[PDB]
Design a protein around this motif. Structure first.
Motif, PDB file in Angstrom:
ATOM      1  N   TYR A   1       2.903  40.522  40.124  1.00 34.12           N
ATOM      2  CA  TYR A   1       3.825  39.494  40.599  1.00 34.12           C
ATOM      3  C   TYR A   1       3.975  38.372  39.577  1.00 34.12           C
ATOM      4  N   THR A   2       5.104  37.671  39.624  1.00 37.65           N
ATOM      5  CA  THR A   2       5.332  36.533  38.735  1.00 37.65           C
ATOM      6  C   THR A   2       5.452  35.215  39.507  1.00 37.65           C
ATOM      7  N   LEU A   3       5.047  34.125  38.866  1.00 38.35           N
ATOM      8  CA  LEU A   3       5.190  32.802  39.452  1.00 38.35           C
ATOM      9  C   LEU A   3       5.550  31.796  38.368  1.00 38.35           C
ATOM     10  N   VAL A   4       6.739  31.212  38.477  1.00 34.19           N
ATOM     11  CA  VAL A   4       7.225  30.295  37.456  1.00 34.19           C
ATOM     12  C   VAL A   4       7.264  28.860  37.963  1.00 34.19           C
ATOM     13  N   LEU A   5       6.555  27.981  37.264  1.00 34.74           N
ATOM     14  CA  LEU A   5       6.550  26.568  37.608  1.00 34.74           C
ATOM     15  C   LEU A   5       7.249  25.758  36.525  1.00 34.74           C
ATOM     16  N   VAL A   6       8.457  25.287  36.826  1.00 35.15           N
ATOM     17  CA  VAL A   6       9.179  24.411  35.913  1.00 35.15           C
ATOM     18  C   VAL A   6       8.554  23.019  35.952  1.00 35.15           C
ATOM     19  N   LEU A   7       7.787  22.688  34.919  1.00 30.25           N
ATOM     20  CA  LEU A   7       7.044  21.431  34.893  1.00 30.25           C
ATOM     21  C   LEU A   7       7.552  20.482  33.817  1.00 30.25           C
ATOM     22  N   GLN A   8       8.049  19.330  34.250  1.00 32.32           N
ATOM     23  CA  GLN A   8       8.552  18.304  33.344  1.00 32.32           C
ATOM     24  C   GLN A   8       7.610  17.097  33.390  1.00 32.32           C
ATOM     25  N   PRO A   9       7.649  16.229  32.356  1.00 35.47           N
ATOM     26  CA  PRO A   9       6.710  15.106  32.220  1.00 35.47           C
ATOM     27  C   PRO A   9       6.494  14.268  33.482  1.00 35.47           C
ATOM     28  N   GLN A  10       7.493  14.224  34.355  1.00 38.18           N
ATOM     29  CA  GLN A  10       7.439  13.358  35.522  1.00 38.18           C
ATOM     30  C   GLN A  10       7.923  14.006  36.793  1.00 38.18           C
ATOM     31  N   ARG A  11       8.198  15.302  36.743  1.00 45.12           N
ATOM     32  CA  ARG A  11       8.676  15.981  37.933  1.00 45.12           C
ATOM     33  C   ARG A  11       8.399  17.477  37.837  1.00 45.12           C
ATOM     34  N   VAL A  12       8.381  18.137  38.986  1.00 42.92           N
ATOM     35  CA  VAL A  12       8.174  19.576  39.056  1.00 42.92           C
ATOM     36  C   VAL A  12       9.203  20.206  39.993  1.00 42.92           C
ATOM     37  N   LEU A  13       9.731  21.362  39.603  1.00 43.96           N
ATOM     38  CA  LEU A  13      10.754  22.038  40.394  1.00 43.96           C
ATOM     39  C   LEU A  13      10.159  23.054  41.366  1.00 43.96           C
ATOM     40  N   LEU A  14      10.480  22.895  42.644  1.00 41.18           N
ATOM     41  CA  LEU A  14      10.029  23.825  43.665  1.00 41.18           C
ATOM     42  C   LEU A  14      11.216  24.284  44.504  1.00 41.18           C
ATOM     43  N   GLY A  15      11.083  25.440  45.143  1.00 38.26           N
ATOM     44  CA  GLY A  15      12.161  25.982  45.946  1.00 38.26           C
ATOM     45  C   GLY A  15      11.716  26.378  47.338  1.00 38.26           C
ATOM     46  N   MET A  16      12.465  25.924  48.336  1.00 36.55           N
ATOM     47  CA  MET A  16      12.184  26.251  49.724  1.00 36.55           C
ATOM     48  C   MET A  16      12.567  27.695  50.014  1.00 36.55           C
ATOM     49  N   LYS A  17      11.555  28.531  50.235  1.00 34.58           N
ATOM     50  CA  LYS A  17      11.768  29.942  50.531  1.00 34.58           C
ATOM     51  C   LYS A  17      12.460  30.087  51.885  1.00 34.58           C
ATOM     52  N   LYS A  18      13.623  30.731  51.874  1.00 33.91           N
ATOM     53  CA  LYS A  18      14.497  30.783  53.046  1.00 33.91           C
ATOM     54  C   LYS A  18      14.228  32.018  53.892  1.00 33.91           C
ATOM     55  N   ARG A  19      13.714  33.064  53.229  1.00 37.38           N
ATOM     56  CA  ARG A  19      12.978  34.118  53.992  1.00 37.38           C
ATOM     57  C   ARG A  19      12.071  35.096  53.288  1.00 37.38           C
ATOM     58  N   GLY A  20      11.755  36.168  54.060  1.00 35.85           N
ATOM     59  CA  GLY A  20      10.773  37.047  53.485  1.00 35.85           C
ATOM     60  C   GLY A  20       9.419  36.388  53.391  1.00 35.85           C
ATOM     61  N   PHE A  21       8.645  36.857  52.423  1.00 34.81           N
ATOM     62  CA  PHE A  21       7.268  36.422  52.217  1.00 34.81           C
ATOM     63  C   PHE A  21       7.186  34.968  51.752  1.00 34.81           C
ATOM     64  N   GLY A  22       6.468  34.147  52.513  1.00 36.78           N
ATOM     65  CA  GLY A  22       6.257  32.757  52.150  1.00 36.78           C
ATOM     66  C   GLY A  22       7.385  31.843  52.578  1.00 36.78           C
ATOM     67  N   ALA A  23       8.211  32.321  53.504  1.00 32.71           N
ATOM     68  CA  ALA A  23       9.346  31.548  53.997  1.00 32.71           C
ATOM     69  C   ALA A  23       8.898  30.303  54.747  1.00 32.71           C
ATOM     70  N   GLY A  24       9.637  29.218  54.565  1.00 28.68           N
ATOM     71  CA  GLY A  24       9.322  27.969  55.232  1.00 28.68           C
ATOM     72  C   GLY A  24       8.423  27.096  54.386  1.00 28.68           C
ATOM     73  N   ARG A  25       8.105  27.573  53.187  1.00 26.32           N
ATOM     74  CA  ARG A  25       7.229  26.837  52.286  1.00 26.32           C
ATOM     75  C   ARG A  25       7.886  26.619  50.935  1.00 26.32           C
ATOM     76  N   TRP A  26       7.465  25.566  50.243  1.00 27.77           N
ATOM     77  CA  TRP A  26       7.954  25.278  48.897  1.00 27.77           C
ATOM     78  C   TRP A  26       7.190  26.065  47.859  1.00 27.77           C
ATOM     79  N   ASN A  27       7.938  26.796  47.055  1.00 24.58           N
ATOM     80  CA  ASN A  27       7.360  27.766  46.162  1.00 24.58           C
ATOM     81  C   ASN A  27       7.798  27.635  44.730  1.00 24.58           C
ATOM     82  N   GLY A  28       7.040  28.216  43.809  1.00 24.06           N
ATOM     83  CA  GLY A  28       7.547  28.390  42.463  1.00 24.06           C
ATOM     84  C   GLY A  28       8.448  29.604  42.470  1.00 24.06           C
ATOM     85  N   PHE A  29       9.034  29.928  41.329  1.00 25.51           N
ATOM     86  CA  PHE A  29       9.943  31.060  41.278  1.00 25.51           C
ATOM     87  C   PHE A  29       9.263  32.308  40.723  1.00 25.51           C
ATOM     88  N   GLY A  30       9.687  33.472  41.206  1.00 28.58           N
ATOM     89  CA  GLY A  30       9.117  34.733  40.771  1.00 28.58           C
ATOM     90  C   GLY A  30       9.357  35.849  41.772  1.00 28.58           C
TER      91      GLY A  30
END
Length: 154
Positions: A5-34
């Motif tokens: 499996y892959t997990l991508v965390l877009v990390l910037q000096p002062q912020r981090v990008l997360l995505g709200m999983k809309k379904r499937g595995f881990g839905a309802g939670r903020w996730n990295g991409f992969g």
């Protein structure tokens, strides 16, 4: 036996990008991409592929920052997740059918609406430390056992 499996965390000096999983595995939670790593592509290529399919973002260079093994009670295949990071991104994060991207401040990461294991290895990520982790889950909420250490080679 494990599955890649892959997990991508877009990390910037002062912020981090997360995505709200809309379904499937881990839905309802903020996730990295992969996602799952397919046959015919390298692990890094799969990380790029899923990042584009879920955010529309492309990346010039990806950096290996950790590897986390997940065990779910009752499921035969262990989850071998290769964690990646990046600062330089190309484009604008748009909503896909799976993820709803959003920027968060480094002091406002919504751990209460993320996977419980994130509260353990995220401090290492923010400190630019490489790490190896193992988490045994019972359901999607309870962590039974876990190991976490810093590494020099991912």
């Amino acid at each position: 036996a494990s599955r890649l499996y892959t997990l991508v965390l877009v990390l910037q000096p002062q912020r981090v990008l997360l995505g709200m999983k809309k379904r499937g595995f881990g839905a309802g939670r903020w996730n990295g991409f992969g996602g799952k790593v397919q046959e015919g592509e390298t692990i890094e290529d799969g990380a790029r592929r899923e990042l584009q399919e879920e955010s529309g973002l492309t990346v010039d260079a990806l950096h290996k920052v950790g590897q986390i093994v997940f065990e779910f009670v009752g499921e035969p295949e262990l989850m071998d997740v290769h964690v990646f990071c990046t600062d330089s991104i190309q484009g604008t994060p748009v909503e896909s059918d799976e993820m709803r991207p959003c920027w968060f401040q480094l002091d406002q990461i919504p751990f209460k609406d993320m996977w419980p294991d994130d509260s353990y290895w995220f401090p290492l990520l923010l400190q630019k430390k490489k790490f190896h982790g193992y988490f045994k889950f019972q359901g999607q909420d309870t962590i039974l056992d876990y190991t976490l250490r810093e590494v020099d080679t991912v």
